[PDB]
């Protein structure tokens, strides 16, 4: 029932909705200020950057569910981050555990990385424990590592391997 | 009230700021000369997309109406703070919104951005406004003599600040 | 209260190609009339970010273009600056130059802080003269030959009025 | 009745069927043969430059009648070369004497030149004798100028001086 | 004679856009399935005047999109050029497939004078390989998890045709 | 007949253009590869807007249709030669237009651009074409010898002329 | 004996040693870093930028002295900052008066402002009664204004009029 | 005889950097006495086919550098233009004043072909304003506070000869 | 020692930074690839001339040697957090410089960015280089698995971090 | 006689020709401006590299010394036709050098570059250059009145001009 | 220990313009032996910051060129490389190219992290076979008239070796 | 003895005397005639240019003995244009054939072309028979094809097929 397809220019007006909510960033610990203009302009410069991919999440219906990015990807190391975006209206659906699955098919199948990893905010214990069940290892915890509503925060940052990923059930 | 929102400029709202931008009774607030072409607005909005050191918000109501501007400018990376101003349209003038557009400026600078100060500029001649402020927690730190050319004569500024830790401990 | 000054717009400069095309308007602003569409808009864009003028289309209440005026080749250090203005056909004879010249004026000494405005007009006009020193400018020049104009080459008087004598 | 104006980007539709004329453009000793964009990225090279003026006519109904131009203005000997076309629909009807003086009148009361000169086949003596009664003198006869219809043919060059023009009547 | 081959054009983008979004599609061309139309669109651009490829769509009588044929790699000096081919999954299983490669060859060897056409194909595919052999082609190379594909390394034959084969 | 005319090639025929450009059997009559994008067609177009070399024409009919093209390429500045190709679309072929717009061609070459030669290609295997020339004043003066790659096979081509003092004379 | 000159090219090597010298970049607020090709570019592009003078100081034998800055000039409020550093070689010769002079005299009699005003560190109280001999006045005490050596600091920013300048001895 | 008026040129600019930056000799100009050499030699570059203006430099029959002559606002429709001259500090009390003067005034009516050729000049010089009465300049105007000097604004006198009155 | 200077990069000293980034086991300690041409290295330096994320330093004793490389890198505007990275070449390993070095770094991040978190990464298998660190007052935060791909492996790192109210009240 | 040759204009040919553009005794001769700094004179040299409407020659004798200049301008592609003009340099003056580079024109415009037609301006008021044209064969086709200002007034000039066909049939 | 490979500079393009217009050197890489050093160096500044290849110059103890070897077609994803190398004509009977297959082999296997390197080799070179057989290569096809060289189109082996089995 | 190599910039001295020497640029038809900067400009243009391969004849010395290209290469049909010149101070030596020889081999065991062709002087007997020797065949007598000295002049056009150069001894 849910598709990850390559973000495309007619998809960012809902990035900008997104990439506009203070509730929504904080999850990815970015600011929540962006015009479209500055928007669009950094679409265009990094359209054929081969270090990212960005994946727009629809159902069936076609209805825009949310967003998964891999970025930072490296080709020595084989590594990426992973970000994930659900959007309000479709939280609490159980959704993510699906989206995390595509999202790690994509890496380990399709683009031969050997490691994703993530971060959550420490204070985001039911995503923490949702990370955990797909897989993903607590490898830190980064002290006052980011600035989020007043105050600094830890984060843990988690991973998971193609080995892992692809070999588990053998 | 919880009704106003501050978002970011978008070129739509720009016949909107040059509305207020060739009006000689807004300008004077901000001892800006009140004169520019739709296209000087434009080409300079054009050339600070991705300038880090502004965030240029428009204000709106429930019901989208535009209700005025507020911008952090000269914000700065080592010593942490920015210059607040503000423009309420003629219309929306003395409803009570001044005080929570204050403060939601405020919140953005110390909750998201963390910046150490915020200063401001205020005629000397407009006392009531002095007032306000000081009542939203500014405190007098400079009183600046013959600053500014106004309407055929010099006029003297108060120079107005407040910092993160009081904010944040109130 | 019925006219005002704003600043000129990509929208207006139909009206001004009008302007700039006529014959007896450019003459007295000693300039050829001659000046395609896209010589003048080129222009336009070019001066946009252009601090050393500041060119206003004249409204009425209804919003209709009731002519231009001009303050050039500001000067940062001496503090000067030139005055023109236009006032269409259509429009001429209803008495708004005076209220024009004493916007211009209040621009130029109100919010511009500038020091002196000076303007040029044909000796062989004296109704305009008389209009001007009527409004405070005084003559400081009599420039012989100075522009050729329809054959010929013609006088203008250069006049002038300071800060301190319009805001006193 | 008629009236010459600056050349605009609306009227290329005009000049570009005149162009491609051939019996038009023998008049003026040039290949009729001018895409539409040739022409167009001509005129556009050419807004500012200040050694020609190219003026359409019109009647009062505002049908386009012809073309006047100055061309190859020199500012230090102040002389140029005048071409006039009239086109075939309204060839005959009385206009070429008036369109002379007006461009002459231009030419010596608006651009202050001294000399306008132009450039006649031999075996036009219809325009050869149209331009001697609006003042114009034979200075050359210039043989084999001018590659035309399969030979080579002599053209009259001819003039009128700013003097002549203005001060004959006194 | 119903099938077609024709220069890829602008207006086809969108058909080729949802081909290289295919997972299964791109597969067969051992290719990410991630392409933004702007990154689509952008390379069509870049490539317009590049001499070392022709990229075709290959259409039916009422113009419906079949499929894509490629020649690649187009060599000066060599006179080779690598040949892929896409039928789009409405319309496989259809017997197509024969009359586009032999389409393709006839372009390669008639139109561009190539001295010969080579092809990449997945060792897990032996049909395609086999048709690929009933159109003359034949192996000249195994190559030893050469893509990784869905998980795992796999291996591809090459195979080849030569300008003299195909003429007679 | 008189009803046919030659014209400058403009933006507006280049789809007639890309249609004739992409079909083999009207491409094989120039030795030219028969695929060419719209977008390679256009920007080549725009390329050669200012080229002098080179003349490109479109014949129509009284009415309009689109008969064909006449291009006259590779025009020498001191050798006064250039090269006549022609097209005539597939529904026009065998109508009678082939000797009116072959004359045209020369008339343009010879009276207007006053070239000294013109050349042309056209297959030894289409004897049929090469009668027609010499009907039409061409003479061979070269048979070339496996020039072109077509269909599979190098084919021998005419070369075939006629000089300005010729056609003039006739 | 001692004069302010334009700043040139050739200063720009006498530039870099003071802007990478952290005890006399701490007098201006400013970080002590700056590339060569930092300050060669940036110098490049405020060549014709009429916001700022910036001038070199000599003394007879030519050698250099320090600089003096005039920046954020604004011409309708005819305001500029002030800025000064002597070398370290330099430093109490009793140069600083006269050079202050020399900046006011510019300011003042040359460039037709009608403000000048400076930034001094609280903690700085000798520069503070220097400025004050020379006729600078407190208009701010500017709380925490600049992060300096591991904590944020205090300001005085001064200022003196044209008109005190040119007529308190009349 | 002794001394020649001639292009400026790049290798010059070094002499004009010297006298931009004297503050004695830009007061006669009614210009700011700062400009870096980059600000001067960008300003060369981007108007050496400025038609406008004619910049000369002066020199003595050894090769010395006297000073410069300017002809600027050089006018295509009103044939008029404005002079301007500095003779350098180490020259000036030579009389060459007037040779320069004259040599200007040749190039403006016998090479460029003006009518009219005009001056300003500090009322306060009234050594300069007798020179050029000498050199046929009469007062059209005397301009009241047109530049800022030293502290206060000034009046200078606009002074003219035309082509007829030079030629005759 | 006090001998030793921090300053930053020029263009001079990018042979010395090529040797260094061409040196396998310099590199090795920044799990970064160790192939890169002096026109890579040039034309990155040119790029970043201005970028306000980084600070690169060339560290130099007191006659000049170059005997390192210290660089904060990825500097954030909001969290006020960086990556430090140091590289003392092979002839100075050994000498004592680290630890001075190491605090020098810390020293401008603190008292001169006013920044709040320094992070660094170090090999795992390199534990004498991890108990410099922890005596440097750095703490684990992190044990990265399988992070980096070094010598035809995957390595563990730890990432270490100080806080700037830790280092300013020691 | 044979000792003297023309050649293409180079860019070490410039400070010869600077010098006869800045002499106003030798401009004169050509109704030209005699201003030209060394920066217009190479920049314009730059523009008309691929100019094919011009050809400039630098005449030398058997040891090099710079005699003169040698141009053909306006030289058009249809009607076969070129202005030349020359310059012999003062101290060559009168040598007997005049005749046998106009011949050497004439030759590379009817032998080499294939035109009809070459005319030439000289002042009727130099009538000893009129005679010597005439006896080299150019024949007066107009007089034309009062073309140029030169030293203070107009002055009337003769068009005089060589056909290809007398020329190779002396 | 003594042969050292190193990233190509700009200061070793000559070397490289003297290999690369050496017909017998480019004959063992099918490449046309014709470039001028303006197509070398522009091509060199036009990859600088292309990841896809890798290109060293071989080095002996006392810095002589010795060779190059370059690894290209570097593809993320599926992880291969194509491998080649040349030893100019004074250091060939040397005994180097063991060492210098093993490096290139070291690099990509242990720095680049690839998964398959292949070469291409003439099948008339049986010599360069057998070496590189002996350095743990795999033939894994026989590519039919692939290259055009002296006149006739030629065989060459494709041959391969895993990080796998290089690590083991 | 004789080697050729690709033209180089260090060889455009030696290009340029060619170029401008009238009785060598008479074999080729083109005007004697080109700037150092045009030349110079041309070859920038064309270093990757892929239809055309220039070369420079050396002898063991490394004297500059000629030129070799091959022209207009196309790579359907498979044929290409030669041209040869040998410098004066060389002509007569017998290295003629060589070359020819150095450039076919070049053509047909290198670039793999089907088809060399070449133009020669019908009046140029020596060198029609060279070719023929050489194995060229006529296939063209070109009427009145290139002005030359005065007169248009006929032209021989020869080849040679790949075929019979590679297989004739077979």
Not at 35 to 46: A, I, M, P, R, V
Not at 53 to 78: M, T
Not at 141 to 157: A, T, W
Request: glycine residues 4%; proline residues 2%; aromatic residues 12%.
């Amino acid at each position: 029932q849910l598709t990850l397809r390559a973000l495309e220019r007619g998809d960012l007006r809902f990035i900008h909705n997104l990439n506009n909510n203070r509730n929504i960033m904080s999850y990815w610990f970015e600011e929540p200020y962006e015009s479209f203009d500055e928007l669009e302009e950094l679409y265009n410069k990094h359209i054929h950057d081969n270090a990212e991919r960005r994946f727009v999440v629809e159902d069936a219906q076609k209805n825009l569910i949310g967003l998964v990015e891999l970025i930072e990807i490296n080709y020595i190391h084989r590594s990426a981050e992973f970000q994930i975006i659900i959007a309000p209206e479709h939280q609490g659906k159980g959704f993510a555990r699906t989206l995390i699955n595509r999202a790690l098919d994509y890496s380990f199948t399709i683009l031969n990385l050997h490691k994703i990893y993530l971060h959550v905010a420490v204070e985001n214990p039911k995503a923490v424990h949702l990370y955990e069940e797909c897989g993903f290892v607590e490898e830190g915890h980064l002290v006052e590592e980011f600035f989020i509503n007043g105050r600094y925060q830890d984060v843990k940052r988690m991973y998971i391997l193609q080995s892992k990923y692809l070999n588990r059930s053998e």
